[PDB]
Amino acid sequence: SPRVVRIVKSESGYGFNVRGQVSEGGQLRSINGELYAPLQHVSAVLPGGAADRAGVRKGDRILEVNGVNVEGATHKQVVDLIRAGEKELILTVLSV
Amino acid sequence: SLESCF
């Protein structure tokens, strides 16, 4: 089930990495038995960092960034959205 | 696929 997480930048930034496709759209993939267009995902979480402390986990699939739907998004679109805020990030994630 | 750090 999707959930919303709020992350406040610390000195180590937010403390997580995102990996995913370069292109927009593409073949549907089932995540937890539900079909979605391709989703960028959390590929690493710094132990003790802001994302870790906020409950973000490696493998989390990213559905929204700062209230903007990023289903099927390009990597660049998701990077730019994560950096949109000066010190706060709100994610809608699906854990696997 | 591409990876970025935050």
Curated annotation (Swiss-Prot), chain A:
Protein purpose: Involved in the retrograde transport from endosome to plasma membrane, a trafficking pathway that promotes the recycling of internalized transmembrane proteins. Following internalization, endocytosed transmembrane proteins are delivered to early endosomes and recycled to the plasma membrane instead of being degraded in lysosomes.
Residue ranges of coiled coil: none
Stretches assigned to the PDZ domain: 4-96
Protein name: Sorting nexin-27
Subcellular location(s) of the protein: Early endosome membrane; Cytoplasm, Cytosol
Modified-residue entries (Phosphoserine), positions: S12, S23
Domain writeup: The PDZ domain mediates binding to a subset of proteins containing a PDZ-binding motif at the C-terminus: the specificity for PDZ-binding motif is provided by the 2 residues located upstream of the canonical PDZ-binding motif. The PDZ domain also mediates binding to the retromer complex via direct interaction with VPS26 (VPS26A or VPS26B).
Subunit structure: Core component of the SNX27-retromer, a multiprotein complex composed of SNX27, the WASH complex and the retromer complex. Interacts (via PDZ domain) with a number of target transmembrane proteins (via PDZ-binding motif): ABCC4, ADRB2, ARHGEF7, GRIA1, GRIA2, GRIN1, GRIN2A GRIN2C, KCNJ6, KCNJ9 and SLC2A1/GLUT1. Interacts (via the FERM-like regions) with the WASH complex. Interacts with SNX1. Interacts with CYTIP. Interacts with DGKZ. Interacts with MCC. Interacts (via PDZ domains) with SLC9A3; directs SLC9A3 membrane insertion from early endosomes to the plasma membrane.
Residues of the full protein shown: 39 to 133 of 539
